Paper text:
Astroviruses are nonenveloped, positive-sense, single-stranded RNA viruses that belong to the Astroviridae family and are named after their ‘star-like’ appearance when observed by electron microscopy (EM). ORF1a and 1b encode non-structural polyproteins, while ORF2 encodes the viral capsid structural protein that is the target for host antibodies. The capsid core domain forms the icosahedral shell around the virus genome, whereas the capsid spike domain is thought to be responsible for the attachment and entry of the virus. The capsid spike domain is the primary target of serum antibodies, is the target of all known neutralizing monoclonal antibodies, and is being evaluated as a subunit vaccine antigen.
Author numbering:
A (entry chain C), B (entry chain B): 425 to 490, 494 to 654
Write the structure that this text describes.
Amino acid sequence: PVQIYSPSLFGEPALYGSTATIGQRVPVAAVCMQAVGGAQKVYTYSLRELLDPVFVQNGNIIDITVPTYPIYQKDGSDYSPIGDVYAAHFTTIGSSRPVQWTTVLWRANISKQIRLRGHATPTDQFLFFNPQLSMSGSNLPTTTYGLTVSSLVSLTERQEEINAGKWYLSTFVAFNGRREFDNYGIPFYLSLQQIDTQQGNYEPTTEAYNVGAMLNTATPLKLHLNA
Amino acid sequence: PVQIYSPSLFGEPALYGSTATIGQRVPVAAVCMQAVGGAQKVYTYSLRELLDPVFVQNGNIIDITVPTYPIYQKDGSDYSPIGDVYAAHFTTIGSSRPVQWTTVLWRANISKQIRLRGHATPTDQFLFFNPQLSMSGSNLPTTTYGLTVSSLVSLTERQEEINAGKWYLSTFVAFNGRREFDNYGIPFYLSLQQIDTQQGNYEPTTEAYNVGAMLNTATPLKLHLNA
Ligand SMILES: [Ca+2]
């Protein structure tokens, strides 16, 4: 595996999860990941710049760009490649109400405006594990994580800028979803039902740190290379 | 300036702030930072182990051990050294209600049980910038940070184990406090008043990520060397 880190931009949002499919509905415009040699697809609105990443393997800084699979945009009925994925990692978060989180590291190969827009009927929800300060009695606090699920919305049309050569994170998450496909052993999940916006706390996992689903201090990303 | 990152242990709490002083009251047992050329001191119960840290300076992994100042424990009236500080950084988060935050990287020089015990009268409060998913209408969410302040408590006696050779983070924070002293340029602030548990949101800063006051994705700590 590759350990990944980078300074964040001023006010740059943290990684999060989005869903945009209910029944047969799909978003009008979104970031798409289709399986190699397959027609299956998942969607996302997650697009996070890595301002200046650093890649580390087995304690040594390496150059990832010295077997990739592309990442597309869906723009209406028109899919188009926007970059290539170098590493990805998946993990199941939770027990009786699992959240499947797939993070992919990719480098844009075109400097373009990426349109995001949900289906006209509200279908778009967003997921985040918000770190909380937990106190039981008069002891040292710990960090718990709650699952924040936004209410259903129809994502207003918007333009997001990507630049050739830059690195980007993109999650593909699902709430109690199905195994749609996998790419080089990394599964990709999809859920098709509205998510109850009332959710409890989720026990932390060391893989949720690796995929970036739960924030922690000085904790780098850690994904599998395409192999 | 050194970038630091590390994988977190299973469920390891994220960096938080602690205050333990009101008026002339000081904790019974806590981690102490003394001015290199003075008798001034600040206190904390923050003590977070870095499982397997990596230090990066100007793009390259470095061995930071090849001018340090000690970090002590206060145990009753007794003070004793427990480690040596290799890097530190300071920043203020907020305008009308500022929070002074100093993070110090240090390596333990003894393996023993460190005593934490607040004053008998409640004096201990803890502070955390909890990352939140905020949504304005039907648009992409952002990450805001609220200021979680625990209620006044008297920290129950406890023992925290440290091991010589391991790396530990420790914060020294204040809520609209005074600059007690500085160690190799990095100021250390102290607050001597109970903190109102009702607080608002704090706008992001790049320094908050570097010192680790606000969590972000794949974002390392970045502290100054001792010079
Ligand atoms: Ca002693």
